[PDB]
Structure formats: structure tokens, C-alpha cells
Design a binder for these strands. Structure first.
Ligand SMILES: [Mg+2]
Ligand SMILES: [Mg+2]
Ligand SMILES: [Mg+2]
Ligand SMILES: [Mg+2]
Ligand SMILES: [Mg+2]
Ligand SMILES: [Mg+2]
Lengths: 70, 131, 185, 58, 441, 262
RNA sequence: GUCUCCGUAGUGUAGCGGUUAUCACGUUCGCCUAACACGCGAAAGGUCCUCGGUUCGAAACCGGGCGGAAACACCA
RNA sequence: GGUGACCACGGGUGACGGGGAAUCAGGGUUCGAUUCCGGAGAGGGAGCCUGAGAAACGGCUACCACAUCCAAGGAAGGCAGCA
RNA sequence: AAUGAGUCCACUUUAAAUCCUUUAACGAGGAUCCAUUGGAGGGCAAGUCUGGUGCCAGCAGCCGCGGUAAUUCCAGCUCCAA
């Protein structure tokens, strides 16, 4: 659910184990999923993907370059 | 000291500010930028004057060393040099002192003095307390 | 407000299509033969040639005897023969289209010090220019992309402070000498 | 939810961690360009193969 | 220059813990007569007029209407010899964590027990809180303290000898048990609600001829609280030791931003260098510093100041965090630590995996005992046996534990104020001790 | 705005002032005076960027406040005084005199004149009206007005005003065949002879000018200053005689000058 | 900082101071197919959020602390 | 009477206008809050004194919305200026 | 053999500083003083290499890859583009 305008969306979590870095009530950053509001690939009706969670990028956690803010 | 030469160019004299002004360049082959005082007495010898009226500034050294160039200023007399010259070059020579408060504190005093009307003792006593 | 200028332009143009064998091999050949650092500075000289050719073609579209065409054509030809990329007798706008990037790459200081024998190879030439060993006229230049004019062609020489013209050997020579005298009194 | 999220990070989890082999540094910049120009432009090979690629898995 | 000493006032619920210090702050010149009359009128309606002096310290509306102190509060005044601040205490079973925060960030303490019948006896007992207060005083590093008895006007007869003598002997034998010297600590009779014996010897009671205090620094004699508090030992200042600063609270002041507040332990803090907060591992330049709404050039040790930092929010740094200069050794999150502890009281045996709450400086974090290393004698730190399997009261031991929540600690051999800690469970101090070795994450 | 503007941005300054872009943000903003700010030359830039007698605004302020700058025989202490067209700048201490004349490129050049030639000055009349008591009046291209002129002098002629008196000594009629100078627009600073004047009622009269080289051009009547009786000018002309030459014959002159100097 | 409520396999929760179990499930294994689909039977899955106290013994009775869900104030 | 299918009038603008910027066979398509010029505004409106020039807000008056101090009788507000 | 990136004296700059340019003295052999970001089926330059997984995890802008011998996932090595 977006902070502004309260809209609820569905966002893909794009890597092998980056669902485990996600817990409830986090502040995620979501960008478009590639083709301007159109579903991409075998994923029905998903137009967004998560870039950051809790103000740290999923790329850094996936590469292990920095740790969850415990 | 062995290899230092002063060459002047764009020389001109004016009587409006009672001085002779020019731009000069000193050739230091393998030394640092020559200190401004050294230019001062060497130019004083060059123009047969004293190394107190000589005024130099703005020395920029070319890439790779060698030539550095600055603008020269020589006056006819010391009183004129005190009359028509920026105060900071006088201070560089020690002839002008800048012992004064900060601009911030001066503004604080000026704004606090605006609160007291007329009364001389209180308008001069405005800045005594809040030091 | 501020008294800045913020007037700036890019000096290179990226190729329209990437990952093509012919352009890649040609660019790599140019880089390897002329000792360039990357593909950006071969695209830079390509852009320079492209702008010059555009100006030449635009002037050629103008009618002959047009004073604007004449003035800009003589100016462009004069610049081209000062940088040395054009023959002195080839004072025509038509020949400007026939020039190549290899002509411009040859006039670089990095290639020039190699051609003058001051360096043993093009990469030695570049690393020798960067370390303030090469002087032109009297100024020392540490820029490999320094385009050398015809009158400045003759005045390329070693820097006086460098340990190849005047004295003052480098830090490793002095360290070796002091180690030798410390070990051998 | 149908309850299938429990398998997240499975294959990456089971992949055996093997350390990278320590190796000599690679030249960068002009030297890298020189080296790769040398490898693929100045060389003569007497062996057939119809100009096999630079990453030949032979 | 002029020195500063932190003062904390500890006592019982409704023991005049705030009323008599309101008297003190009014007499020494902290407030005016108009404000105290305002307090009188505001207390007149709902009948809590006896606490009109107490509401000066009781800043909260909830504290006023409930009639008790929920959390500590701070005040300032200038004495006749140096500058000091004062901290009150909640003085209640429910708010022990709040008062150990203030007593940890202290230089000296004063303890109050009502002289009336039925309160002093309930005051100093097993459920009595005076034992807890005096114990945590020495636990948290209150090297010197004074004691003053309040509310002897309700005694029969009011202002009497034998009542005063029996209560001072009781507290004297208790502090002799706990390690404090009765000779050093002053014993002062003060009548709170009447406001007697703070500046002058109240002649309504003539039987008290003054106290004498003898100490290693020297000797002093006293007839009033001001005479008592002007001759306290100026505590040492570990200025050369690198910066350490726990955080009592964080404020979001309008116009300046986040202002963490804490008492400086070691080092000198001045606006103009970066600081590092250990439990959260954030780095931030300090912008300005200020004690008691007065801007300062430096933060010397022992200073309870609020300092402004930049480009951060209130949720980044919270209560219990410790700050330190990144230029010096930066404080950082600790995985665990070795502690020598003194077991005080526990109905059962202590096993590994016991997870009470550890209260160090400002932080209050539950720590779980990883395992027991060895048992130690009461005195001299003597070896008893290796690899214990249980513990009981009246024992000392070496134990390694890990905090459940992120926490930063310092070994006592390195940072003494952060080496002291307490263990709380079932509304008593179960264990006390210091820290010896700490690992760094 | 709620009132008059008293600032002037550096880049919005007139181009012929030849101010750069990096020194500052502001321009001199010349004060109100005999000349419009679009075609005036304030003394600050004249003494700082033309002559280099001063290095900053403060030095030229010190120069002016010592009462050495004389315009039209009067000492002017205004640092931003609008000098304007052909006002004599007299510096007695160093003993040279300047006439402010547009060059071949339509910019105010540093033109040096003799003191006996500096004593007089040409003026272009802008309007002639009769005042109270039937007294005629005459208004120059400057703000200067003079009573009792010659009745022969008509609108937009040229009169010879001598300094220290302000009187008329001689005049040149605006007639075909008289040497002129263009004081506005593209042909600014070009010296030539009046060849034809076609007049358009209700609009701007257009006059045609041919120079000595035979190059003919035209301009509006408001942009013409008659300078000579037929062909001999009554003032000392600058370098190039106000003959605008194109870039083709400018480049080779530069090359010949370099070859002579090299 | 205070108060209010909740917290048992992974979700949905039975549960007694003297037994934590079941259920739609979730998972796994046999069960047929080259792969399925449908479909039959079993197993595992719990410090009862954690730490303790009362008791002869507690998940449940109580004291804390932790996480979440509410509200209250908190201005160097 | 006046204006309208040569688009009046109305509505929308995520519209301040322009000099200009991006893209670049030619033709075009988008962007110009943004340092220069012109305009508007000073929380929303409204009304005035002074002055040559203001419907000014680092001038005043009033209402509305927020909001400071108080001894509750009053007093004082305008960062779309630099921080 | 040669240099800087850094330490660092002086000069210079500057209202005063700062930076750049000069210039002492230290300053390089894994010269460890360490170049990264994305890819290797096609588009589109680059592997029919090896180990795991087995229509699961995942990749994939699009075609498509994965159901036990993956040129496409997760990794190692090796190449590719800037
Ligand atoms: Mg708008
Ligand atoms: Mg605009
Ligand atoms: Mg504007
Ligand atoms: Mg306005
Ligand atoms: Mg207004
Ligand atoms: Mg791979």
C-alpha cells in the first residue's frame, strides 16, 4: 500500500532469496517493472518491482554488501 | 637568488593616482614562486626607489614553473600610497590594522541598538550586557 | 544572481548501434596503433572530423563567390593547414571531405614524440608525456591530446627539469645511489 | 495465500559455496586496450578451426 | 572557576521527594513567589495543595493529577560556592527503570525517608524501597551522598531527638552493611511541608546541634542543607579519556530538529566534529550544544547537556544509545561481554538461559546468560570452582551473556561509568556487578 | 515593478560597452543625463576599460573625486555620468583631451584631440520652439538648450557650440551633399556624404549616405549627425575615417600587419 | 515514558494446576501417468513469545521483558 | 446593437509569456518552474496613509485560517529573502 | 630507470583563508598505492567449460530457459562491452 494516495499494488520481489529479506510493515521502494504499466513475462498483472526495503537496496542485501538494520 | 630577473611590460604612468603601474613577470628556473617582498626590493632597485612604496599582488605561476606574472604598482610618495590604495594591501605591509569585531557581532549590536530610542546612555549601553 | 557561465558542450558522440564487429575492430585497431586510453577519445576525434566535414559540406552548398563562403572557407583551410592535417597546396573545400581521422590522430603530441624518436613506443610516449618530460617551445605539456601545429612541430623537446634533458635525476636514481654509498663507503 | 512461499531462496541456499580463486590483477585503461589489441590483432596461427571465437571451449 | 555537580533526590512514594526540593529551589532562587502562588491556586481546586511545592518538579499534568512522579525531571540553580543541577526520582515500585536512569547520570545523591510512624518502618524493609535506592546508589557509581530526613512535623512530639536518633542509626547500620561510611555522609533534619532547615537553622527545633562530616579530602561542619551541599567532593573529570555520552532522551525542538539529551561521561564535546551512536551505528556531525537553555562552547565531563545534530530524524537515535567521537575510538555494537556479578536475592536457583533485564547507564536491555564460567568468593575475587551448574543468593560468579536487543557496553576497566550495571527482576535488584571483557562486532 | 529601475544586469548592458561576463553580475547603470543609457558611455567604464587609468570602481571614484575629470568644460564627480556622443573629456593633470566618437564598428573609441580643437563641439539640434515673450529656443541632441539662435538654423541641423560660453559660433545646414555620421542602428559610426533624402509623412524619413569608397547605404533621419560642410569635417576623424570595411579586407589587413610586425 | 489488548505447530485455534491435540489445511512419503490431472493411507510439525516466581508440580495463577495492535503526553 | 463553423461562448491545462533547450537529412516533435527581458504575488481576500513613484506587505487597518506571550486586563504576528 | 596519489616546508593565491600552479624533503614490485558495472541462446560482442537444482528455485524488455546430461537459473573458471 503506497504512502501517498493509499493505493494498494502488487510488486514482484526480483531475486532468488530476497523474499526472506522482506518482513511486514516495511517501507519498500517500488519502481516500474519494465514496459510502462504493462505486465512483463509470465507474471500476470504485476507492473512493479521492489528496489529498496527499509531504506536499503535489495541488491546490496542480495550481494551481501550490507546487513539488515537490526 | 643566483638566477632571478624582473622584466616589466605594459608599463604606463598616470598622474590621476600619482603612481606608475605595470605588469611584471619573474623568471625562476628551478625555485618556488618568488616571495613578494623580494620582488619589492628588486623592483625598487630596478626603478631606483625604496622598498616601501612598491606594491605587488596577483602573482600567478604558469604551469611547469618558470614564469610567474603579477601586476606591479609603484607610487611617487608614501603619503599618496596611503591615500589612494586598498586597505588590504596596506595591511599586508603592516600600515593598516584590521582590529575589529565580526560582521555578525556588529549586526547584533546594530539591531540591539534599534530597540533603544534616543537615550544616549542606553543606546551606547545596549551592547554592554550581551557580550 | 550568480556570475557563472555554464556554457559547456560534449566532445563525443556514441555510435548509433553497439556490438558490431567491423566498427569494434576498426576502433580497437586505431586505439592499439595510436596508444589511446579508451573508445571515448576515438569517438572524440571522430566527432571533430564530423563537425569539420559538416561545415565543409554546408559551405559547399553555398554558391561560389559568396563572401561568407569565401571567408569561412579560407578560415577553415587555414586552420586545417595550421594543424597540419592538410597539404599546403590542397586549398580546396572539396579536399576537406577527403580527410580522415588517421590524419588527425597523427598530429597528436603522443604520436609526435614517438615519430621524433624521443620515445621507444607509443605507450612509452604517452607515459613520458604524462610525467612532465616533454616540452613544446618553452612550455611543458602533460596532455597527450595536445594537437601540434606546423610551427610547433620543430619545437618539441625534452623538459629541462626532466632527467632526460637537464640534470636532477629521479627519486629512484637518487635512492639507489644513496643506498649504494651507504652500503659501500 | 495458497502457501508456496516457504521455498524462497532454495537453489541459492543449496548451492555449495566455493571460494573464488586468487589471481593476478588485470591491467586497466590504456594497458588493457593495448593487451586486447595485441591478443586479437598481432598474431599468426598455423592451425585450422575457421577462426574460432576468443572463448573457445576446446 | 565554578564546578558543576549532578544531584539526584531519591526516596519513597509521597515521601515529600518533590515537595521539599520545591522548597529548596524556591529558597535558593530557582522560581519566584508568583509561580509558587500559581501552583498553590492550581492545587487548591482538586485539593492536592500539599504538593504545590512538589509540582515544580512534577512537570507532567499526569504527575500532578496522579500525585506521584512518573519520570525524572531536571532543574538548575546556583549555590553559594559552585553550580549544580538536581534530578528528582519517581520513587515508586513501577518506575524503577526511570529513576535508575537519573541516578546513573549523577554525581551525588540525597535520600529521603519520612520520619512519621508507619512510613519509615515500611520505608526500610524487604518490600521497602529505601534498600533498593541505597543499593542502586552504590551500584551505579554514587561515590558520595548525603541523607536528609523529611516530615518530622507529623511525629509525636514534632521535631524530636529519639525518633531522629533511631532512624539515623537504622540507616547508618544499613549503609555500613552496604559499604557506605556513616561518618562521611551528613545527617540532616528537614521539615518539608513547613519548609524548615534549608537556609537557616530552624529554631522551632533546638535539640539538633549540627552534624560533622570527616572525609579523605578534609573536614566540614554543617547546620543546613546548603552548608551540607556546598562541601561535597567535586567528582573527578576523565577529560583525556575519549568521548562517551549516553542519551537520556531525544527531543524534536521546533526550528532546530533532533536534540539528543544525555550526561557527558568522558571526553570534551564541542560543536565541530562528527559523532557516532553505537547501538544504531549512525554517523552525524554535531551542530550545537546547550545546557539548561544556555549555549556552551564545550561539554565537559559530568555535564547533562542537550546537543543538536543534523540531517537525522528522531527515530534514528533513541533512548539508551551512547555517543562517541569517531575521531577517537568509536563506540560500536557489542556481541556479548564477561561480567563479574554479586547475587543479591532470588527465590529460586539461577541457571543458564535466565534472561533478566540489565540496566546499564541509560539503557535497559534484557540479557540472557549464555553460560556460567566460574563461581567467585564474596571478597577479594577468589576462585571457588569452575563450570557451575546453578547459582543461589549471596554468591559471586563470572558469567557471559548476550543482550537480546542490540546494545553497547564498555568494560569497567576502560569506561567506569558504563562498566557499572544492575539486574532487575520481580521488583528487586537480583544481581549487581561490573564488566570485565567485551567483544566487538 | 512599483517604480523606476536603478540597477542594470551585466549581460543586459549595451554591447558597445564591451563589458565581459565573468567580472560581475551588474553593469554601471549610468545616471540620468544628456544622453540615453543605450548610447552613452559612463565615465567608470571609460576610465577603467578604455584607458585602464583605474583598476576598479573605487579607483575611478578616487580619480573623479579629486576633480580631474572635465566634461564639456565642467568637472563632473558622477562616477556613472553618461558621457555620450562627442563630449570632450579633458584631463588637465596629464594634459590630454578626448572626443567621444563612434568607431568604424559603432563603438566609442579612444580618440585624442588637441586643446584648441577641444574648445568647441558640434551639436545636432533636436527641436526648435518659440517661448514666452516670443523668445526662440533651440534644443540640441544633448539636453542642452540655448535661447536666441540664428533664425536660419532649422530642425536636425548641426551647430558649433564652443565650451565655457555655450554660444553658437557657426552651423551646418542639413542639405544634400554634406558630410554626415550615422549615430544609430547597423550603420553606426559610418562617415559619408548625404546623397538623397526621401521623406515619408506620418513615418520615419529615410536618408541615403555614400562614403568616400563609393559604398552607399541608408538610415533613418533620426540617426544622422551632420559633421562637415560638404566634405571637409569640422571635427578630427578617428582611425579609418569612419569607413566600414568588410571582413574580407579586414583579415588581409591583419595578415599584412602581422607580416610587418613579424 | 505510561496505560489497554493480543501472542500454542506455518497459517485457524482446542487445551484441564496432574494429557500440545484435532481440523481446512501447509509439508513429506508410498499411491497411477513419459509429464500430468483426479484420487486412496500414514508421518513429522510445540520451551504454549521469552525469562522467572507460586506450587509437590503451571503454558495456562502471578512478576517482568520482547514483538505486534490502540491511546496518552513527552519542546535543549 | 456587438461576437460567432474563418470555432464565438464555455470548459480543461500537470499553462506565467518570450529570448531559448532536447532530438537532428530535409520537414518536424517535445520542453522552457530555472539566473536575461516582461508580468503576478507576498497565508486568503479587501481597504488605505506617506511619497514623484505602492493598492507596498522586512508600511498600516479590518475579516477569515493558523499561531506567540500573559500576572488572563492585554500585547504582538507573516522566511514564495539568506541560512 | 620515471612519475604522480598521498604525507609535507616555504612561496603564491586570497579581505583573510581554501583550491589550482610553483617548490623543499619522504613517497612503488603481488609497484596489495588491487577498477568497477552489467552480460556470454538469439536480437547483440562474448562458453555447445565444470559443479549444484530438477517446470522447484529462479532467469527472461521479446522470443523463450528449467519437469535429473540447463549454450539461458544458483556458483567456480574463462571471455565480452563501456
Ligand atoms: Mg500554474
Ligand atoms: Mg519561463
Ligand atoms: Mg524575473
Ligand atoms: Mg506587488
Ligand atoms: Mg498588501
Ligand atoms: Mg554463468
Amino acid at each position: 500500500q503506497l504512502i501517498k494516495n493509499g493505493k494498494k499494488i502488487t510488486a514482484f520481489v526480483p531475486n532468488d532469496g530476497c523474499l526472506n529479506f522482506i518482513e511486514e510493515n516495511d517501507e519498500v521502494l517500488v519502481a516500474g517493472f519494465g514496459r510502462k504499466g504493462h505486465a512483463v513475462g509470465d507474471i500476470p498483472g504485476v507492473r512493479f518491482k521492489v528496489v529498496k526495503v527499509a531504506n536499503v537496496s535489495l541488491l546490496a542485501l542480495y550481494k551481501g554488501k550490507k546487513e539488515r538494520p537490526r | 637568488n643566483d638566477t632571478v630577473t624582473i622584466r616589466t611590460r605594459k608599463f604606463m604612468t598616470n598622474r590621476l593616482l600619482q603612481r606608475k603601474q605595470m605588469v611584471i613577470d619573474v623568471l625562476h628556473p628551478g625555485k618556488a614562486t618568488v616571495p613578494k617582498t623580494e620582488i619589492r626590493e628588486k623592483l625598487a632597485k630596478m626603478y631606483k626607489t625604496t622598498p616601501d612604496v612598491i606594491f605587488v599582488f596577483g602573482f600567478r605561476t604558469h604551469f611547469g614553473g618558470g614564469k610567474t606574472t603579477g601586476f606591479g604598482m609603484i607610487y611617487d610618495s608614501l603619503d599618496y600610497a596611503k591615500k589612494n590604495e586598498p586597505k588590504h594591501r596596506l595591511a599586508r605591509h603592516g600600515l593598516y590594522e584590521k582590529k575589529k569585531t565580526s560582521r555578525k557581532q556588529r549586526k547584533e549590536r546594530k539591531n540591539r541598538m534599534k530597540k533603544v530610542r534616543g537615550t544616549a546612555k542606553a543606546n551606547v549601553g545596549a551592547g554592554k550586557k550581551p557580550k | 544572481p550568480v556570475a557563472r557561465s555554464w556554457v559547456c558542450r560534449k566532445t563525443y558522440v556514441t555510435p548509433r548501434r553497439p556490438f558490431e564487429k567491423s566498427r569494434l575492430d576498426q576502433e580497437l585497431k586505431l586505439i592499439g596503433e595510436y596508444g589511446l586510453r579508451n573508445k571515448r577519445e576515438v569517438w572524440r576525434v571522430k566527432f571533430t572530423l564530423a563537425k569539420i566535414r559538416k561545415a565543409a559540406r554546408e559551405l559547399l552548398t553555398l554558391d561560389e563567390k559568396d563572401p561568407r563562403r569565401l571567408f569561412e572557407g579560407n578560415a577553415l583551410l587555414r586552420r586545417l593547414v595550421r594543424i597540419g592535417v592538410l597539404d599546403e597546396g590542397k586549398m580546396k573545400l572539396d579536399y576537406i571531405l577527403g580527410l580522415k581521422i588517421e590524419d588527425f590522430l597523427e598530429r597528436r603530441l603522443q604520436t609526435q614524440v614517438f615519430k621524433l624518436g624521443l620515445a621507444k613506443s607509443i605507450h612509452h610516449a604517452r607515459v613520458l608525456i604524462r610525467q612532465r618530460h616533454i616540452r613544446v617551445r618553452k612550455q611543458v605539456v602533460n596532455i597527450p591530446s595536445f594537437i601540434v601545429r606546423l610551427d610547433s612541430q620543430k619545437h618539441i623537446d625534452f623538459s629541462l627539469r626532466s632527467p632526460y634533458g637537464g640534470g636532477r635525476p629521479g627519486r629512484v636514481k637518487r635512492k639507489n645511489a644513496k643506498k649504494g654509498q651507504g652500503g659501500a663507503g | 495465500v495458497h502457501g508456496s512461499l516457504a521455498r524462497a531462496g532454495k537453489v541459492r541456499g543449496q548451492t555449495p559455496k566455493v571460494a573464488k580463486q586468487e589471481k593476478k590483477k588485470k591491467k586497466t585503461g590504456r594497458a588493457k586496450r593495448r593487451m586486447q589489441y595485441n591478443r586479437r590483432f598481432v598474431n599468426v596461427v598455423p592451425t585450422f578451426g575457421k577462426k574460432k571465437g576468443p572463448n573457445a571451449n576446446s | 572557576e565554578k564546578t558543576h555537580i549532578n544531584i539526584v533526590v531519591i526516596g519513597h512514594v509521597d515521601s515529600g521527594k518533590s515537595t521539599t526540593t520545591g522548597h529548596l529551589i524556591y529558597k535558593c532562587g530557582g522560581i519566584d513567589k508568583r509561580t509558587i502562588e500559581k501552583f498553590e491556586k492550581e492545587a487548591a481546586e482538586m485539593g492536592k495543595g500539599s504538593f504545590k511545592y512538589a509540582w515544580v518538579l512534577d512537570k507532567l499534568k499526569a504527575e500532578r493529577e496522579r500525585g506521584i512522579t512518573i519520570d525524572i525531571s531536571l532543574w538548575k540553580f546556583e549555590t553559594s560556592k559552585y553550580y549544580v543541577t538536581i534530578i528528582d526520582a519517581p520513587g515508586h515500585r513501577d518506575f524503577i527503570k526511570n529513576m535508575i536512569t537519573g541516578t546513573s547520570q549523577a554525581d551525588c545523591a540525597v535520600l529521603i525517608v519520612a520520619a512519621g510512624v508507619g512510613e519509615f518502618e515500611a520505608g526500610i524493609s524487604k518490600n521497602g524501597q529505601t534498600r533498593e535506592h541505597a543499593l542502586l546508589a552504590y551500584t551505579l557509581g554514587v561515590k558520595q551522598l548525603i541523607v536528609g530526613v523529611n516530615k518530622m512535623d507529623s511525629t509525636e512530639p514534632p521535631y524530636s531527638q529519639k525518633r531522629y536518633e533511631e532512624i539515623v542509626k537504622e540507616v547508618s547500620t544499613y549503609i555500613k552493611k552496604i559499604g557506605y561510611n556513616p561518618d562521611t555522609v551528613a545527617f540532616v533534619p528537614i521539615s518539608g511541608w513547613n519548609g524548615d532547615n534549608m537556609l537557616e537553622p530552624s529554631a522551632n527545633m533546638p535539640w539538633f546541634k549540627g552534624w560533622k562530616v570527616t572525609r579523605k579530602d578534609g573536614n566540614a561542619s554543617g547546620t543546613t542543607l546548603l552548608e551540607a551541599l556546598d562541601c561535597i567532593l567535586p567528582p573527578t573529570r576523565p577529560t583525556d579519556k575519549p568521548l562517551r555520552l549516553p542519551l537520556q532522551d531525544v527531543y524534536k525542538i521546533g526550528g532546530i530538529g533532533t536534540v539528543p539529551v544525555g550526561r557527558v561521561e568522558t571526553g570534551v564535546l564541542k560543536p565541530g566534529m562528527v559523532v557516532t551512536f553505537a547501538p544504531v551505528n549512525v554517523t552525524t556531525e554535531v551542530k550545537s550544544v546547550e545546557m539548561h537553555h544556555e549555549a556552551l562552547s564545550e561539554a565537559l565531563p559530568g555535564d547533562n547537556v542537550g546537543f543538536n545534530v543534523k540531517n537525522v530524524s528522531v527515530k534514528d537515535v533513541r533512548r539508551g544509545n551512547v555517543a562517541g567521537d569517531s575521531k577517537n575510538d568509536p563506540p560500536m555494537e557489542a556481541a556479548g561481554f564477561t561480567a563479574q556479578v554479586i547475587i543479591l536475592n532470588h527465590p529460586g536457583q539461577i541457571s543458564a538461559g535466565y534472561a533478566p533485564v540489565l540496566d546499564c547507564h541509560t539503557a535497559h536491555i534484557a540479557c540472557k546468560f549464555a553460560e556460567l564460567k566460574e563461581k567467585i568468593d564474596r571478597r577479594s575475587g577468589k576462585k571457588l570452582e569452575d563450570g557451575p551448574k546453578f547459582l543461589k543468593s549471596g554468591d559471586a560468579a563470572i558469567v557471559d551473556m548476550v543482550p537480546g536487543k542490540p546494545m553497547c557496553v564498555e568494560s569497567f576497566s576502560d569506561y567506569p561509568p558504563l562498566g557499572r550495571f544492575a539486574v532487575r527482576d520481580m521488583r528487586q535488584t537480583v544481581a549487581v556487578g561490573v564488566i570485565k571483557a567485551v567483544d566487538k562486532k | 515593478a512599483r517604480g523606476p529601475k536603478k540597477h542594470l544586469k551585466r549581460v543586459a548592458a549595451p554591447k558597445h560597452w564591451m563589458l565581459d561576463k565573468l567580472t560581475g553580475v551588474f553593469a554601471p547603470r549610468p545616471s540620468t543625463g544628456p544622453h540615453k543609457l543605450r548610447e552613452c558611455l559612463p565615465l567608470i567604464i571609460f576610465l577603467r576599460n578604455r584607458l585602464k587609468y583605474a583598476l576598479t570602481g573605487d579607483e575611478v571614484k578616487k580619480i573623479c573625486m579629486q576633480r580631474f575629470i572635465k566634461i564639456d568644460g565642467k568637472v563632473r564627480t558622477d562616477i556613472t555620468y553618461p558621457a555620450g556622443f562627442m563630449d570632450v573629456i579633458s584631463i588637465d593633470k596629464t594634459g590630454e583631451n578626448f572626443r567621444l566618437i563612434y568607431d568604424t564598428k559603432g563603438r566609442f573609441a579612444v580618440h585624442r584631440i588637441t586643446p584648441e580643437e577641444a574648445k568647441y563641439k558640434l551639436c545636432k539640434v533636436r527641436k526648435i520652439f518659440v517661448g514666452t515673450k516670443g523668445i526662440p529656443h533651440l534644443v540640441t541632441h544633448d539636453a542642452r538648450t540655448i535661447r536666441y539662435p540664428d533664425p536660419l538654423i532649422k530642425v536636425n541641423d548641426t551647430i558649433q557650440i564652443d565650451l565655457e560660453t555655450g554660444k553658437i559660433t557657426d552651423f551646418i545646414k542639413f542639405d544634400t551633399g554634406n558630410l554626415c555620421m550615422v549615430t544609430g542602428g547597423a550603420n553606426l559610426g559610418r562617415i559619408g556624404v548625404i546623397t538623397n533624402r526621401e521623406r515619408h509623412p506620418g513615418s520615419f524619413d529615410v536618408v541615403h549616405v555614400k562614403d568616400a569608397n563609393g559604398n552607399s547605404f541608408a538610415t533613418r533621419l533620426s540617426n544622422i549627425f551632420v559633421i562637415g560642410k560638404g566634405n571637409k569635417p569640422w571635427i578630427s576623424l578617428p582611425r579609418g575615417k569612419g569607413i566600414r570595411l568588410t571582413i574580407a579586407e579586414e583579415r588581409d589587413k591583419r595578415l599584412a600587419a602581422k607580416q610587418s610586425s613579424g
